[PDB]
Amino acid sequence: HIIENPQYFSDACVHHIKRRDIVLKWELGEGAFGKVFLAECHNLLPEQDKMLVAVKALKEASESARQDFQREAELLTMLQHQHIVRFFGVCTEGRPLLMVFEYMRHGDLNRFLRSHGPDAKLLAGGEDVAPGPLGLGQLLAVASQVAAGMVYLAGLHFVHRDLATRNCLVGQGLVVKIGDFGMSRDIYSTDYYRVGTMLPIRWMPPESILYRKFTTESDVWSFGVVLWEIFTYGKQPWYQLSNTEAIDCITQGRELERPRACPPEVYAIMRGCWQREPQQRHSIKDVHARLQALAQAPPVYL
Ligand SMILES: Cc1cc(C(=O)NC(C)(C)C)cc(C#Cc2ccc3c4c(oc3c2)C(C)(C)c2cc(NS(C)(=O)=O)ccc2C4=O)n1
């Protein structure tokens, strides 16, 4: 293989994990192009010679696929922060290619929210969470932490483009962190519009649908929808409507209704996120600060 293009040396110090140090216990989740496993990982952290981790096994077929894998591994090494799920490294030794993340006890935020909702067919609960509905303060803490993660991404001129509760993870003590899923889980497929391309239509603003534009202000719109998700306990936006009908709502300026468990003060934040003009939307810092204020002193609501 010979060099015939500009070569950029500069790179992220991506941590490589030996495959022998990863011990797969069992499958946690599955998608069309990947699996998530629970695993024990040796020699990863000090004085914690053994620890539980979430291991993504990704089916990267082409050379282009493995380039995307390396590109992503590079970005996640750079983007490490407090409300972003912790990425420990990769295993490109053999096949499949693995990405190692921290174990988040309660899984993704959508499934978590659904399991604590009023319409939950079974009660989910543990040592850290009470079965059934969460507190208003707990709901605000969740949103506030997600917002905090978005502040950091916006600071680095970085757009998620698929900000939704399904891509947020929930750990012990109800610590919420932003992650992502490229594996196309069969559980969250109706959340994406398919033609020929996969678009999270119901979470996307007018400018993305109409003009194909995505900025940090588009993530603010998407966060407003996450806020709606949280206060409906993981219900799908426009759940009655089809993908095209939902596109009609967003492009005609028809907004999501105030949830049953949502105070007007919290709905005002959502409405602020859903301004048609991106420049007219509140900054993610301003949204975060307002959520954090409300989390310290939750409003009274019936
Ligand atoms: C490419 C990529 C980018 C990023 C990322 O930061 N992007 C930015 C920086 C935000 C843009 C993040 C990621 C990831 C990840 C990740 C990390 C941990 C987990 C876990 C799970 O899924 C996970 C995914 C599932 C949901 C599968 C799980 C289910 C359980 N189910 S249960 C209660 O036991 O029934 C238990 C635990 C977990 C779990 O820990 N990937």
Swiss-Prot record:
Motif (DXXLL): 49-53, 119-123
Post-translational modification: Ligand-mediated autophosphorylation. Interaction with SQSTM1 is phosphotyrosine-dependent. Autophosphorylation at Tyr-8 mediates interaction and phosphorylation of SHC1.
Amino acids binding ATP: L28, G29, E30, G31, A32, F33, G34, K35, V36, K56
Catalytic center residues: D162
Site (Interaction with PLCG1): Y301
Effect of G224S: In CIPA; processed as wild-type but shows significantly diminished autophosphorylation in both neuronal and non-neuronal cells
Residues carrying the site annotation Interaction with SHC1: Y8
Induction of its expression: Isoform TrkA-III is up-regulated upon hypoxia in cells normally expressing it.
Modified residues (Phosphotyrosine): Y8, Y188, Y192, Y193, Y301
Phenotype for R290P: In CIPA; loss of function
Tissue specificity of this protein: Isoform TrkA-I is found in most non-neuronal tissues. Isoform TrkA-II is primarily expressed in neuronal cells. TrkA-III is specifically expressed by pluripotent neural stem and neural crest progenitors.
Residues on Cytoplasmic side: 1-302
Protein kinase domain location: 22-291
Annotated effect of mutating Y8F: Loss of interaction with SHC1 and altered phosphorylation of SHC1. Altered neurite outgrowth and altered activation of the MAPK pathway
UniProt miscellaneous comment: Trk also stands for tropomyosin-related kinase since it was first isolated as an oncogenic protein which was the result of a fusion between the tropomyosin gene TPM3 and NTRK1.
Record protein name field: High affinity nerve growth factor receptor
Species assigned in the record: Homo sapiens
Native organism taxonomy: Eukaryota, Metazoa, Chordata, Craniata, Vertebrata
Residues of the full protein shown: 489 to 792 of 796
